[PDB]
Amino acid sequence: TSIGKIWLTVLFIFRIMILVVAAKEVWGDEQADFVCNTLQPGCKNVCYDHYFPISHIRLWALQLIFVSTPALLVAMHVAYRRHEEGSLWWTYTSSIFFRVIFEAAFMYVFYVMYDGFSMQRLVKCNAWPCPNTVDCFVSRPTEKTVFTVFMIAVSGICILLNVTELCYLLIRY
Amino acid sequence: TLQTILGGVNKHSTSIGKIWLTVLFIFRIMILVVAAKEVWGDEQADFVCNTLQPGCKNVCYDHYFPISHIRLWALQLIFVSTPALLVAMHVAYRRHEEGSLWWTYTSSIFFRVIFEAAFMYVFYVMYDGFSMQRLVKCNAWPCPNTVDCFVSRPTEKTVFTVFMIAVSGICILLNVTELCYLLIRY
């Protein structure tokens, strides 16, 4: 279909380019420029690890890998089978079903792990060994927000494109 | 081996689009990667503020550079290049299988004008002109009353800012003339 042939794969390269040429160096000094107002040794390590259990760019790297395997699998699978309708139709509809699942799953993780799509300048931390409560300051909170909003919006569009192609087939029956 | 990638998009082009638009495109790409990248390398490492307050440097840098210049140019290049990529993908595949091509083409050059005009507008409003300053005064929390902070390489960043803006302004003028020739023919 026009949407599947063009728009899906165009937006996919769109996400890859944003990740590799632009975003990857916004997050370069994420822990080098974390600053905490304390004299306690080790407070910076625990407080950074508490508020960033996994970095944003590495979630996107994982997400891109997962949503590309169903495309990569269906190509290899048919090639081997043809080396030696319902089957091909079943594989196609299933493949676009998994892609919707993966995109939905990862957008969910972003929301609940990071409490929204906006990054704060100041984080308050009280995990051991830090004393009562310590102020720590994030590096480049505004730029990281801009790319987060960009990446989420593109993913949301990809979900909408997939469901239309899915609806396009079920009505065809 | 980007010759084969460009060669396909080199065709399916008009007189000045086949030559002038594309050469200016590699012109901007080369400057971004070859030269301008090593200028903005230490934008935060060499930001210096005259204070003893922890965390004042982070908020002051983030307040005056909400998004770096190079990553605005990186985004701008990606956006204006997609209409070319779509035209090559959409048309060639159907050519494998006048007005339709005319409608798609004149539409594509309409989006390229919009993106470049939009991004130039952002540069003006966000950074208040095209000249970067040596000194910035910052009073966001947690900084005490008002703090002096100093920018790294202000003069070299101004030169490349002017250079990229001027080239973008030319690309707009080339696109507008391309529109006129197609429009006058009707």
Numbering used by the authors:
A (entry chain A): 18 to 101, 129 to 217
B (entry chain B): 5 to 101, 129 to 217
What do the authors report?
Connexins form large-pore channels that function either as dodecameric gap junctions or hexameric hemichannels to allow the regulated movement of small molecules and ions across cell membranes. The hemichannel is composed of 6 connexin subunits arranged around a central funnel. Each subunit consists of 4 transmembrane helices (TM1–4), an N-terminal helix, which lines the funnel entrance, a cytoplasmic loop, two extracellular loops, and a short C-terminal tail. Here, we use cryoelectron microscopy (cryo-EM) to determine the structure of human Cx26 gap junctions under increasing levels of PCO2.
